[PDB]
Amino acid sequence: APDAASITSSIKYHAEFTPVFSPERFELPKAFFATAQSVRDSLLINWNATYDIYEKLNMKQAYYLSMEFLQGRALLNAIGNLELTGAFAEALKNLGHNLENVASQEPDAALGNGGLGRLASCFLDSLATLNYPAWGYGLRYKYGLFKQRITKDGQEEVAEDWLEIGSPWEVVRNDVSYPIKFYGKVSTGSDGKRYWIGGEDIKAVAYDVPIPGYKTRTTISLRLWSTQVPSADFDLSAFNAGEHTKACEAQANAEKICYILYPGDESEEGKILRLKQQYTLCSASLQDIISRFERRSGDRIKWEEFPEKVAVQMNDTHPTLCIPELMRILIDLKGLNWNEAWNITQRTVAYTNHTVLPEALEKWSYELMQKLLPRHVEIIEAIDEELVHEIVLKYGSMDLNKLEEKLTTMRILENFDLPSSVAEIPPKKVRMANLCVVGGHAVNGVAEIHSEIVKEEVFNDFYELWPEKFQNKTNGVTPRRWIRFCNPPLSAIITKWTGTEDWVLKTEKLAELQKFADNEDLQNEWREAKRSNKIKVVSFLKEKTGYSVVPDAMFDIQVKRIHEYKRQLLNIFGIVYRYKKMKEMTAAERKTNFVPRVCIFGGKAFATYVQAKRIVKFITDVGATINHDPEIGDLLKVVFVPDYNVSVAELLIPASDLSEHISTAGMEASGTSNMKFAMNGCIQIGTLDGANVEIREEVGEENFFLFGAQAHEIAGLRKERADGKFVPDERFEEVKEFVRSGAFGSYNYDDLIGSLEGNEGFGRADYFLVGKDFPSYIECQEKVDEAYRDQKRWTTMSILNTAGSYKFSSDRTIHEYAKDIWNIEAVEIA
Amino acid sequence: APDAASITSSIKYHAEFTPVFSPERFELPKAFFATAQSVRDSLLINWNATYDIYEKLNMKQAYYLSMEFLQGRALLNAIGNLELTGAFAEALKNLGHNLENVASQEPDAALGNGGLGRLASCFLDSLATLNYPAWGYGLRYKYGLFKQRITKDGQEEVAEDWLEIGSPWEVVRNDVSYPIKFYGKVSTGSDGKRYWIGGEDIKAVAYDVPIPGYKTRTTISLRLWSTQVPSADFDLSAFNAGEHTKACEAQANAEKICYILYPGDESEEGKILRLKQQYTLCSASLQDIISRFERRSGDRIKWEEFPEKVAVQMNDTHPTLCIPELMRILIDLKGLNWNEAWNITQRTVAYTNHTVLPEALEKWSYELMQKLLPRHVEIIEAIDEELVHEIVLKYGSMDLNKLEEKLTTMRILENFDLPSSVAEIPPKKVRMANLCVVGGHAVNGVAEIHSEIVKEEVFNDFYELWPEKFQNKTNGVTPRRWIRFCNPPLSAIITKWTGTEDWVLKTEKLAELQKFADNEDLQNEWREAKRSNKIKVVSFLKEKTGYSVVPDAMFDIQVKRIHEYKRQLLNIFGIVYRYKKMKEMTAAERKTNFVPRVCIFGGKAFATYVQAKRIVKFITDVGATINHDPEIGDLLKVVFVPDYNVSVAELLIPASDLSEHISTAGMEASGTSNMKFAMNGCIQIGTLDGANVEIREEVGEENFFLFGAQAHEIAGLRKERADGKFVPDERFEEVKEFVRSGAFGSYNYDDLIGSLEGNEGFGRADYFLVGKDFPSYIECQEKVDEAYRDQKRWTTMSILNTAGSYKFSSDRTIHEYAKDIWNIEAVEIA
């Protein structure tokens, strides 16, 4: 039970005796490392305790596979969950530092990109807090995706430095390395088994990141794979020769698998790298899982017990190769027979779907996949046949015309021949999505409506064939990271008013705030807290954007991936309109119609996506103009926060008044940031999509600004534009014109406005219905502006957003996956 | 004052809480790391204590710069010098390991190649043991030079794996990184100073290896540089594009500087890499030294005090660039004037020469050096002028004919114009050797005769000009590593007979063994010890060479770089003759004429040197034949030990009866292995060269087998061969014929014997006088064979070799450098 003085000793040791800097003085970077190593000392104890019980008990374990994890900063949650935030703060006090300054030294772990990763992370927090035996598997990416600079010219991208010094959190396990093979060829032995030989050979080495549960000892693992090759493979002959580049090739080719996340896949080179990434994750992970299976199994090792001991969850279609790979292992290596293996596979593997549109789902060149993972392609053709035969088995051959339809939809191989078939240069592809539906026992969506969409549109025929497969698992975020730790003031209020502090665990108690949403004491507290958080942000904003804003404005935040479909363009247009109106007013006329705002944008544009990058450039200029216009002062500010990541979100979210979730209706599957915002009392303006629907429902429609056409309406509305039956609002034109006037400086925005004009053509014709939804939007913003004036109302809406949150705790989501998909029971780590 | 139980705790912590392997079980690799980290815990204490006193006292510090350090294994010497070998052995006992098994897990640190490096290492041991404030600077090479496999085909080379897991000994100092610049161009500012801009920019990051003194706290540093480039330089644009190779280029180009040691320099590519290595060492090191100077200097920072506070020692001509670089810094950066700077430079920098022949000394393409380090080339031309003018100043212009001679010899630029000169496409080069003689206050050789040779041949005119420069500093080896630790049995005897244990420090007490060299008790001990060591080797030999040898033979060892001039060819020829004779004898005729031998060869052949590699292949075959010939049994064994390195030498040397040092007379500068052997009571057969001369003198000519033509005689003897006035012995032909007979199997040795035939031609005509010296050699071996029969004699020769050693302690050598070159006084670390 370590106290502050003990921890002081702890920090001092690691500072001197496990050092990574010169001995002189205790600067901040040194202090961080020492603190982190110190914390890890504890994580390792519990990691071991857990690891041991899991080995000895040999219960069923679950394995979450994801290409991305968005872990962000570890320090505060680690000490938080351990319940030592007090002792550590004190310990750093005596060492002449303060906790928040130390903690802000730590880079965000750049292991993920979007909500896909952040889901995975939250899940691990829950999995561990709830004592459920489960691990994550992922790649250990060196340079993340990219770090975002915002420059005069817009967005520039640069490689993440997170590992420049190295991560004090991770643990290398040198004795955990597996062989991964690419390319090469297959043959048959005289035992009649298949042999996959030749190609390229590389290792995959495990790195463990401990994940401590909240108020428990259960400490699980995010095990990350780093690809490499033994030093022997360095070609001394070539190097001494003079061909330095050439000598390195072997190792360069192996390590690049782990360099960056979603590498550019325009090139054939990129696509291959992608496959190599995917395969590496699956192969390495499965090998490790199986190894552990056997190990725990002693002598009485039975392969029919496998699915009762192991569950693999494929987070989206990237870990698709788990299905063929596990077959391969169970057949070629463990020497079971096909049905045995396939039954084991299906009862192990489950699929989680994340996409609404059947084209977001990934497809691979037959030629290319077959050339890289030849033994897999075999196993895939096999399953494609078996499937074809079972489609034929049901339905019958009476309909012919309809059976022809069902094959072309449901078949894993696209543009292939059937094997034997009554029938009386289009490229050959592999539909990974289809493969995932076939090989898994479960296919889940991530939100009521989305799960419905997979059942009834995306995987239509499949649902008819095997309904018992399809499910929903509505997404969530951990209340640990997203309330308890990121928002200390709100936490204090919540604890006060709900009586206990159990709400961090038993998050339903948030609902008890309901009764008090009028209470004017609680409102006064709540506003003090929300202000206090904004104060911090003002400082941040200065340091990062160079812009001094006032805390006494509405914080109007849209932070997410800078895409046309997310319609940053909409929000900023709305902002443009507000500004134009302001400029054509008297000074106290301005005051009257507009509440003071700070409109906060953040998020990353795909490096190569010319429009998205133009959008970012626009927002910065709009800002530049508005912020330095003296006619506007503090009535409106526009900032673009550079390099939005977990840590940024941990800072903006607690301090937000309004969050924008304004995608073209129906196009989002779930969302997670909305859940996070709601939890902190932020009110949401948005369209009816994803979990906007479910949040709105649960917080109450009176505490959520809704606007714009709904999902159903979209088909028709494009139709309309294409027929020339759309009439733009004249306020919409007013903006477009105003931009064209060179109003935001001398950068030319012709091309940008171009995407919003015409009735056809790939980039033209406002396909994302910004002009359409624009009236309802600015209209809805009026309502907002008004509700902000009625502070007693606004504060109730706030409080109720929080009180509605509890169902979006990832604890709930994990309890569900655990009981309705994996089937694992909580293991106590005494 | 840590005891065994404390150390047990220590090992257990580092095992669990600073781990590098899975938690399960305490295997040997895990045990090593934990022990090493444990040891380092202590090294770091003393490293800091030292570092601190050195900062506070601000006395003069010395900096030894070498391209190679041959540190070998650290564990046993670390615990040895700390005096904890007892506690650690016990601690590992309780953890269920034994010390020697643990210690044999540790790779040799692959930071050096030959004696040049091993000198440097020994020096550090002394420097630290003697409390002299001094550090080493070197590059941190990833893959060493190469690891040697011995295969059926001979020698194969492969990249060193020493860092695959990483080194538990080293300490990264992230806040110690310096800029290194290559290429680019120079200009003049309006301040009239020179500006070197553009080119390539890379970092150099310090890694510290603590070096603990014996029975002291003085723990100094071997600071190693690793070259890299910030992550920002990774080209995301290129990577996502698809040109993976291209994106990496920046970082690949920077890191390769530290990949391997003496990279192949056939190519222009290789030569540039070499220069980059050299420069990196000098620049990084000087920057660090100066930084520390300034830091200690506070306010009263005076650049005329510099040489009184700093001495740089250039180990051979590689760190030559220190001279121009230090000028550059003192001028362009610190803004002194030329004379001020040049005076500071000279009074700082000293040269150590290692070569006998004026062509072993390195020369650089003007074009290439000027293109890479343009600002240096300037400074070099400057010095070349100043020199030219001072040559002219003395001597006068009266002789013309002779002044013309003195310029072409002494000038740093080869094939250049004089500036103003009375005179009434040969490539342009820079003579680094000359530059070193000019810029330094000292030029030393490494052995009496060698130092003489530099004075009177190599740097002839220079000596006349500045005699006060030239010196000698006879080489040495540390009695810590080379007696006290590597030979525990001999150590026990030595302590017994010399009364104290002070002989590890006060190594002159070895001479007291003299009086007892007859004493038959001491002989009995001595032989038991030497046998005990051989026992270990028998085991080793089996495991590595696959050959079971008997301990009850003479151990006849030639371990050094496999070159024609070292004449491995001679020894093996001698071996061939012995074998032929044996085969033409009766069984007890064999017994009568030949003592049982195990002839041990080891050492590395330059990868590309076709003859050297053929030689190695020969020795293995000779072995193969002799070892499995049942007519020979245990009378003769020939083994080639693969991958000779410090650790191997620590094992063979204690167990040796006779060591071979049989270079073509006069060609060696010093040698160190001979010193090591002598110390362990090994008797030496050798030619009169290097320190063979000085060892022979000191142990006594009656305890050293000498043979073959002397230095003076060599010129004449080549002359003779070239005139066709050489007559080969018919025993020499007997061997050649015997080989040609296909006697050693079916590999063809025509080309090999070829080098030994003819009177001219580059590879032909036995230029190394193997045939010449062959009679005296085999003759001398007879004497040996005989003296081995007279065990009382043999054991006295042994004992006296040890008693003669004391003067070859590197303590002596360092005391001398310290007082007669650097001028530093012992600093007590209370």
Numbering used by the authors:
A (entry chain A), B (entry chain A): 23 to 446, 511 to 916
Quote what the paper states about this structure:
Starch phosphorylase (EC 2.4.1.1, α-d-glucosyl transferase; SP) catalyzes the reversible conversion of starch and inorganic phosphate into glucose-1-phosphate (Glc-1-P), playing an important role in starch metabolism in plants. S. tuberosum phosphorylase is the first starch phosphorylase discovered3−5 and has served as a model SP for biochemical studies of plant phosphorylases. The most significant structural difference between the Pho1 and Pho2 forms is a 78-residue-long peptide insertion in the middle of Pho1, termed the L78 segment.
The free structure was solved from two different crystal forms that belonged in space groups P3121 and C2.
